[PDB]
Copies of this chain bind each other. A is one copy, B any other.
Amino acid sequence: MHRIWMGTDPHIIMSALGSFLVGAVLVMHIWAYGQFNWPATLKAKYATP
């Protein structure tokens, strides 16, 4: 399966994968903060009475 990487460039591949992971993780967290009501429960816990 390694034979897919021949003819490619490691730094280009790692840049493309790294930019993907940054974007996916950020999209997933900002989505998840909307659904799970966190950190909104954290903010309410320490908020001023």
B-contacting residues of A (Cβ < 8 Å)? 3-4, 7-8, 10-11, 14, 34-44, 46-48
Contacts and interface: CB of A to CB of B under 8 A. Distances in A.
A27 B35 CA distance: 19
Contacts of A44: 48
Number of copies of this protein chain within its complex? 5
Contact of A48 (B4, B8, B14, B40): B40
Nearest to A34: B43
Given A8-B11, A10-B4, A11-B8, A48 B41 contact: yes
22 contacts: A3-B10, A4-B10, A4-B11, A4-B14, A7-B11, A8-B11, A34-B43, A35-B39, A35-B42, A35-B43, A35-B46, A36-B42, A36-B46, A37-B43, A37-B46, A37-B47, A37-B48, A38-B46, A40-B48, A41-B46, A41-B48, A44-B48
